[PDB]
């Protein structure tokens, strides 16, 4: 058997993450000061007699600074009061911010708040084009709409054209904030990534910045970063002790990038165990993906797929040696998970992720069959297989394993493929298909998403790309609607699904596969989040 020649770029990180020794004196010093700053900030939030605009701006700043996870109760209380008081009497910047913050927190505020800013036709009043702060907040708000918000249909185009026009003449850091927002809106960004940018490039440079908030944000970011580096060290050692870099050299070596993905799903300290479990799964399924895509023969992949369905160490002998390596590692990893969850009495929940993994692998094998047979399915059939091969049903399920509050009912809800999950999966599918269409076409993949779309509807590549873009827009509206109260499960179990969608947007920004080629996009994020501390 002649295997195809390897082509993936090596890990660009070497061993620079393998050993991190926390400075406990510095960590304890940061924690002690943060306790004081946290209380000062709580008192700011609880201050009586604040105007609506000031209250919304304070909450917005605390959220962008990445320290709002300390104040979930306080912020919820305040937004709930604002939601139920229904003050519709403010300028564009306050109205748009009010709308965004409430919707992001699940409060279903009416989009009629924008009617006063529009003419008879429902188009935004062009007289608003000289209000830059209003336009910026309208821009950010436009990204949180649902299918019930067609009154905002014009908001993105309107805010964008006039922000672009205004930008070159704006003072700093407002200019940089506007320019950044046009590249990456807040709602669809990865939270730590946007937080790092906001602290260092914007708030640190604001003449009017609150010094207590800025110091709090910097110390908290850097303290959490120490935990993340410990986790990544622990994960780097685990990966090193598996040595797939040598024994499975056909596979993408990307455990740092996998860690960045897990960090995007949740960054908070209470999700430490969850992050570490999640990154191990992402790493391991990536090995399997490359095994199906770029090494295994038809016959091997069949045996591998069946072995995964039976999930039994007895089955290793049916596999070639190189497949024995990944197969044992997979079984062992899930045994690791079981032991890791044993003292909490949550071992039994591991079966949910295992069943999702089997699903991914069945559909990997279908994809391989289609490729060999030269089959181009209709779009409906394509999606019935290719949605699971995003791994996103699987990763969302995995994200719950380490979450201490996840119950059987939460897994049961997820198992039914709820709308918000389906939407996140679709976003991953269509954005990846758009970014990778050309290269996969070159590699002979006749069953690529765009190709299936072209043949099915009888339309150009351009038109198919556009249809896929529409599917993504529909899915984002479904995600936003999925966050609205009453939620079917606690919001805590929705945010990982939202964040998986965000990771798609961030990783394939500018229509490129950032996981396979991390140099352009992921490398700067990894450096900013996991290498460089924020200077104080
Ligand atoms: O080819 S897709 O299925 O469109 C995208 C997936 O390959 C992404 N991997 C990267 C690492 O996490 C698991 C999935
Ligand atoms: Mg693949
Ligand atoms: Mg692909």
Curated annotation (Swiss-Prot):
Function: Catalyzes the cyclization of trans,trans-farnesyl diphosphate (FPP) to the bicyclic intermediate 5-epi-aristolochene, initial step in the conversion of FPP to the sesquiterpenoid antifungal phytoalexin capsidiol. Produces germacrene A as an enzyme-bound intermediate that is not released by the enzyme, but is further cyclized to produce the bicyclic 5-epi-aristolochene. Mediates, at low levels, the formation of 4-epi-eremophilene and premnaspirodiene from trans,trans-farnesyl diphosphate.
Effect ascribed to mutating residue 504 to I: Relaxed product specificity leading to equal amounts production of 5-epi-aristolochene, 4-epi-eremophilene and premnaspirodiene with cis,trans-farnesyl diphosphate as substrate
Origin superkingdom: Eukaryota
Gene: EAS3
Protein name, UniProt field: 5-epi-aristolochene synthase
Post-translational modification remark: Self-alkylated at Tyr-508 in the presence of (2Z,6E)-farnesyl diphosphate ((Z,E)-FPP). Self-alkylated at Asp-432 at warm temperature (42 degrees Celsius) in the presence of (2E,6E)-farnesyl diphosphate ((E,E)-FPP).
Ranges in coiled-coil conformation: none
Cofactor comment text: Binds 3 Mg(2+) ions per subunit.
Source organism of the structure: Nicotiana tabacum (Common tobacco)
Keywords: Cytoplasm, Lyase, Magnesium, Metal-binding
């Amino acid at each position: 058997i002649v295997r195809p020649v390897a082509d993936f770029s090596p890990s660009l990180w070497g061993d620079q993450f393998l050993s991190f020794s926390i400075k406990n004196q510095v960590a304890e010093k940061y924690a002690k000061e943060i306790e004081a700053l946290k209380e000062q900030t709580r008192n700011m939030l609880l201050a009586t007699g604040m105007k609506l605009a000031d209250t919304l701006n304070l909450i917005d700043t605390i959220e962008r600074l990445g320290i709002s996870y300390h104040f979930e109760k306080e912020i919820d209380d305040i937004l709930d009061q604002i939601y139920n008081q229904n003050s519709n009497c403010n300028d564009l910047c306050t109205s748009a911010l009010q709308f965004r913050l409430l919707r992001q927190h699940g409060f279903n505020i009416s989009p009629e708040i924008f009617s006063k800013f529009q003419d008879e036709n429902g188009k935004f009043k062009e007289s608003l084009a000289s209000d830059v702060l209003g336009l910026l907040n309208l821009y950010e708000a436009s990204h949180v709409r649902t299918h019930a918000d067609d009154i905002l249909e014009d908001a993105l185009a309107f805010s964008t054209i006039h922000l672009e026009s205004a930008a070159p003449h704006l003072k700093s850091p407002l200019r940089e904030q506007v320019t950044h927002a046009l590249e990456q809106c807040l709602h669809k960004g990865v939270p730590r990534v946007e937080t790092r940018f906001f602290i260092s490039s914007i708030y640190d440079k604001e003449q009017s910045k609150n010094n207590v908030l800025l110091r709090f944000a910097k110390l908290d970011f850097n303290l959490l970063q120490m935990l993340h580096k410990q986790e990544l060290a622990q994960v780097s050692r685990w990966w090193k002790d598996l040595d797939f870099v040598t024994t499975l050299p056909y596979a993408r070596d990307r455990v740092v990038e996998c860690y960045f993905w897990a960090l995007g799903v949740y960054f908070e300290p209470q999700y430490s165990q969850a992050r570490v479990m999640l990154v191990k799964t992402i790493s391991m399924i990536s090995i399997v993906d490359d095994t199906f895509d770029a090494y295994g023969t038809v016959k091997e992949l069949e045996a591998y797929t069946d072995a995964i369905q039976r999930w039994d160490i007895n089955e290793i002998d049916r596999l070639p040696d190189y497949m024995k390596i990944s197969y044992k590692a997979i079984l062992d990893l899930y045994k690791d998970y079981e032991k890791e969850l044993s003292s909490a009495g949550r071992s039994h929940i591991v079966c949910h992720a295992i069943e999702r993994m089997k699903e991914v692998v069945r559909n990997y094998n279908v994809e391989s069959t289609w490729f060999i047979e030269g089959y181009t399915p209709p779009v409906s059939e394509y999606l019935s297989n290719a949605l699971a091969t995003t791994t996103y049903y699987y990763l969302a399920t995995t994200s719950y394993l380490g979450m201490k509050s996840a119950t059987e009912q939460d897994f049961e809800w997820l198992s039914k493929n709820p709308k918000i999950l389906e939407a996140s999966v679709i976003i991953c599918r269509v954005i990846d298909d758009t970014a990778t269409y050309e290269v996969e076409k070159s590699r002979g993949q006749i069953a690529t998403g765009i190709e299936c779309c072209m043949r099915d509807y009888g339309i150009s590549t351009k038109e198919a790309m556009a249809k896929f873009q529409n599917m993504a827009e529909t899915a984002w509206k479904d995600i936003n609607e999925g966050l609205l109260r009453p939620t079917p499960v606690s919001t805590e179990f929705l945010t990982p699904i939202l964040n998986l969608a965000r990771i798609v947007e961030v990783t394939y920004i500018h229509n490129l596969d950032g996981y396979t080629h991390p140099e352009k996009v992921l490398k700067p994020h990894i450096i900013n989040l996991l290498v460089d501390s924020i200077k104080i």
